[PDB]
Each structure stands twice: as C-alpha cells, then as structure tokens.
Amino acid sequence: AYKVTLKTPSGDKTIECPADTYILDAAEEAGLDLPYSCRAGACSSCAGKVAAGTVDQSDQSFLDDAQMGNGFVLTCVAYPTSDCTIQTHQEEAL
Ligand code: FES
C-alpha cells in the first residue's frame, strides 16, 4: 500500500491506501469525511491538490489539462502510485 498524507484544513493525517483503491474511498474508510458528490470523476466536489507523490486519475473527466498539470486531483477516481501528499478541500482553489 501507499502512505497518503491528507493535508486537511484541520491538520495532517497519513493513511494507507492500496494501489487498487481510490484515495477518497480509503480516506472515508479511515474515518475522514472529505467532500464528494458524484463519485464518478465528473465534478469538482472531491478536488484535492497533490503536493508530492503521484496518482493515477486516468478515469477522471472534469479537470482540464492545466488543472491537472498544477496538481489538482479528483480524489474519488484517483489511485495512488507512490507515497503522496494531497491537500484536501481544494474545490474553491480550482
Ligand atoms: S465527487 Fe464528483 S468528481 Fe469526485
């Protein structure tokens, strides 16, 4: 699994997330209550920003190329591919 450090507005929490599990799902199951709505990669509710490490969000559709190049991620459809750090609650920053 990968260590995913969620940098939330109320501090950091590092969870383990298997390669085959979406970050939001692992976070929810670890007891975090992160924003979401569609869970299909088609909105901005679950947006985060990758500060370090890599994800695979090939499933996503809402973010544009520039947003992804600036590290935004739709956590509901993102798998980790390394140990990573994701700032949560980033929809207003998009
Ligand atoms: S909850 Fe809509 S894209 Fe993730």
| Sign (positive or negative) of CA dihedral 73, 34, 86, 70 | positive
The DSSP result for 19-30, as a single string, is TTS-HHHHHHHT
Distance separating alpha carbons of residues 44 and 63, to the nearest angstrom: 8
Is-contact 75 33, C-beta < 8 A? Answer: no
- What one-letter code names the amino acid at 50? V
HSE-CB at 41 with a 13 A cutoff on CA atoms is: 13
Task: Report which DSSP code applies to 37.
Answer: S
- What one-letter code names the amino acid at 73? V
> Which technique?
X-ray
> 20-30 burial string, b = 16+ CB within 10 Å, else e?
ebbbbbbbeee
Ligand 1, pocket-test mutation among 25, 39, 64, most atoms within 8 A of CB = 39
> Nearest to residue 87, comparing CAs of 75, 76, 77?
75
Cross-strand bridge partners of residue 5: 14, 85
Please give the distance, rounded to the nearest whole angstrom, from the Cα atom of residue 77 to the centre of ligand 1.
8
